[PDB]
Coordinates of C-alpha atoms and ligand atoms in Angstrom, one line a residue:
X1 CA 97.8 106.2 83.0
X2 CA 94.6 105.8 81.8
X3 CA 92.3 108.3 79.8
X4 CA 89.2 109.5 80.4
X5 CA 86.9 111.4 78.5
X6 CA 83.5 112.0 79.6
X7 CA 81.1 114.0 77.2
X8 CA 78.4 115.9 79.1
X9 CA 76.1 119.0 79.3
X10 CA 74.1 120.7 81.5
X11 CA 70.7 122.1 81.0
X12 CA 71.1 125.5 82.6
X13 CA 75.1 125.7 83.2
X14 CA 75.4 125.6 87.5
X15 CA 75.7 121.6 87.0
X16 CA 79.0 120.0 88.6
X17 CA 80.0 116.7 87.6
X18 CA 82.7 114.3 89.3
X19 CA 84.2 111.9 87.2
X20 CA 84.8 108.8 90.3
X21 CA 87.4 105.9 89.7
X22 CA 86.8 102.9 92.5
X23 CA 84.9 105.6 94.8
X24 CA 88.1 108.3 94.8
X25 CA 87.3 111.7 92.7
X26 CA 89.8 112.6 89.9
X27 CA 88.3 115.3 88.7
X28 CA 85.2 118.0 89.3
X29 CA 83.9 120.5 86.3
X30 CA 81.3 122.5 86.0
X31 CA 79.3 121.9 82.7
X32 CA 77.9 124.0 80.3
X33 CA 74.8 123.6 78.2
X34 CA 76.6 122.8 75.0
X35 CA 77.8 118.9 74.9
X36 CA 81.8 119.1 75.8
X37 CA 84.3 116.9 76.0
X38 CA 86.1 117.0 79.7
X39 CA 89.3 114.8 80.0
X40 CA 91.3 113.8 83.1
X41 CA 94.1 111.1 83.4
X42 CA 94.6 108.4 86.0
X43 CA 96.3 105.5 87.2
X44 CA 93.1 103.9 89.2
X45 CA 91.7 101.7 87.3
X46 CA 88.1 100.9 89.3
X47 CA 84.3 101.4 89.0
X48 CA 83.8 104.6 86.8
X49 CA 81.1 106.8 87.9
X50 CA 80.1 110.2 86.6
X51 CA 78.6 111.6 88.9
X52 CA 76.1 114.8 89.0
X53 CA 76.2 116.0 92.8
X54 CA 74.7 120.2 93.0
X55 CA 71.1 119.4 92.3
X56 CA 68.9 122.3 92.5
X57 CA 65.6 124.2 90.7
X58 CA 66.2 124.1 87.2
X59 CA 69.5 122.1 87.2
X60 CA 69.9 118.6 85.7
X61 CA 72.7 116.8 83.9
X62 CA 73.0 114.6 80.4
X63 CA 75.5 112.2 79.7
X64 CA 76.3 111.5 76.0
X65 CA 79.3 108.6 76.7
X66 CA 82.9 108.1 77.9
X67 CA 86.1 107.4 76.2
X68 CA 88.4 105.2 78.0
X69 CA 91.3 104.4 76.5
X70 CA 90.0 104.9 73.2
X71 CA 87.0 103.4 73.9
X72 CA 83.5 104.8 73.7
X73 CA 81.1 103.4 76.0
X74 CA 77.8 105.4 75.5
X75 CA 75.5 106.3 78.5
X76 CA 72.6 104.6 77.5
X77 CA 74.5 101.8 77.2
X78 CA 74.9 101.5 81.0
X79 CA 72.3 99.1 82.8
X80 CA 73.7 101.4 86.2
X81 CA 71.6 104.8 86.9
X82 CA 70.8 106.1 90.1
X83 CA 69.9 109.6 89.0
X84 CA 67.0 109.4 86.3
X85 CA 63.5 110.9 87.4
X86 CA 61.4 107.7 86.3
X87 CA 58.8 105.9 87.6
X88 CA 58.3 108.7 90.0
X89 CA 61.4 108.6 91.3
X90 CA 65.7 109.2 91.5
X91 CA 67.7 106.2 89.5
X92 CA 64.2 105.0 88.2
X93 CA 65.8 102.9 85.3
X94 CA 69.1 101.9 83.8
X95 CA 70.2 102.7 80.4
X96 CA 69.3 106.7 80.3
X97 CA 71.7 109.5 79.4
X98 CA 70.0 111.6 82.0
X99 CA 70.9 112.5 85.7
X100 CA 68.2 114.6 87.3
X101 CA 68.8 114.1 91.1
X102 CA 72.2 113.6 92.2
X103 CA 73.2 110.4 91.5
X104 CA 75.5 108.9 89.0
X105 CA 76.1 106.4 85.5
X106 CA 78.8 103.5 86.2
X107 CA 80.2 103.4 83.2
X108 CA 82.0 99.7 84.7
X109 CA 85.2 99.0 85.8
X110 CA 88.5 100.7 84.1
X111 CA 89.7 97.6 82.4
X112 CA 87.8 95.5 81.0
X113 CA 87.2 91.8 80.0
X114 CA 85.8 89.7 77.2
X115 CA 87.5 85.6 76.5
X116 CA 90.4 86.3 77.6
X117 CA 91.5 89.6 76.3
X118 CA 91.7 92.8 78.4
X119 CA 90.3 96.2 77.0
Ligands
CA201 CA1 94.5 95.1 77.0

């Protein structure tokens, strides 16, 4: 299987994130407002999404990066965000840590490629 770490807090604890491989939900955890490590284990090897989905008064969501197989790929690395408040509104701008309204950070497919070599 593959591994999955996603490192993530919430700024007042209520915030539920869904770690989402090629649209099917692994996993669900509530956050807290310390940055944690969460890891879950799968055989689906699609799109990655975090995904923050209980907006409410006073809740929002930031992302610090993913580890996938070994691999860090850092939030604000991501050009896909459809949950930052910017420019006045949800998934304002690519390449933030932050999910505000519900929404989610791709983090890209499981497996990865670059000349020829699979990562
Ligand atoms: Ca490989």
């Amino acid at each position: 299987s593959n591994s999955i770490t996603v490192r993530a807090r919430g700024v007042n604890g209520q915030e539920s994130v869904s770690l989402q491989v090629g649209g099917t939900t692994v996993q669900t955890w509530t956050l807290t407002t310390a940055m944690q490590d969460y890891t879950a284990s799968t055989s689906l090897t699609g799109e990655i999404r975090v995904a923050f989905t209980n907006d409410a008064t006073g809740r929002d969501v930031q992302v610090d990066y993913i580890v996938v197989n070994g691999q860090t790929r850092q939030a604000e690395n991501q050009s896909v965000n459809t949950g930052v408040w910017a420019n006045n509104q949800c998934g304002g701008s690519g390449n933030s840590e932050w999910l505000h309204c519900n929404g989610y950070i791709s983090f890209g497919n499981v497996s990865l490629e670059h000349h020829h070599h699979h990562h």
